[PDB]
């Protein structure tokens with residue numbers, strides 16, 4: 001998901 | 011230890027400053043004219059909205075009737091806000107160690123409540139700051155927009171007026187936001203206890219922050235816990251107006267990040 005991608009990016 | 015709770019409070023405030031470009035302190039300085047910075051361009055009618063097309067800059071590049079352009083504008087601001095809040099959430103001790111799907115869940119159900127909390131900081135009774143303080147759109151002009159859009163933001167101004175009367179500062183707000191994000195009762199959480207334990211410590215931090223920062227207002231903590239419940243109601247009203255719009259109108263484009271958050275959101 002998009003939210004997951006935002007959470008994973010330093 | 012109370013010392014550790016103050017250290018946590020300070021960590022959250024410092025992270026909050028890092029994560030959010032326009033703080034309440036700076037927003038208040040603008041709204042009251044205390045700043046040295048150039049005055050916001052005031053959008054108070056269709057004509058001034060047109061004139062503002064030049065003056066005001068948006069971070070997103072975009073090479074429809076007014077009511078729709080404004081609504082889409084709030085969309086894109088909300089998209090920016092979700093990313094800022096995500097960055098803040100990740101600074102809360104313990105959060106990045108939670109199950110990743112639970113992190114997604116906390117954000118999905120938390121972000122709008124945080125958006126409207128922080129939007130208040132940019133609001134007074136007469137209007138709202140837009141684009142990092144570059145512009146100021148009047149409450150009356152937004153109210154004057156054709157239905158359903160004239161009612162889109164009024165619920166939030168009404169919330170902000172009462173919320174701002176509590177006179178929280180950025181230090182209070184950082185902890186207040188943290189508590190909300192770490193809500194163990196969001197739908198579909200898998201591992202509740204670690205979230206509850208984190209929130210319990212944040213709540214202790216908030217209680218001590220308010221006791222020290224607002225010595226003469228014993229009731230403030232209990233009132234803020236109620237405002238958290240209230241914020242969920244504001245979000246419910248918003249979601250329902252969102253469905254009305256999504257139908258009362260021939261379809262516009264909804265940003266996919268918002269589409270993802272909206273799914274199963276009430």
Ligand SMILES: Cc1ccc(Oc2ccc3nc(COc4cccc(C(=O)O)c4)n(C)c3c2)c(C)n1
Pocket residue numbers: 053059062063066079080081082083084085087088125129138139140141145147162163166
């Ligand atoms: C030149 C120009 C100026 C403004 C403008 O429209 C805009 C753009 C961004 C804006 N941000 C806000 C903050 O309010 C918000 C913000 C986020 C969510 C909500 C929410 O209620 O969900 C309300 N308003 C009100 C805007 C209106 C356009 C299109 N052109």
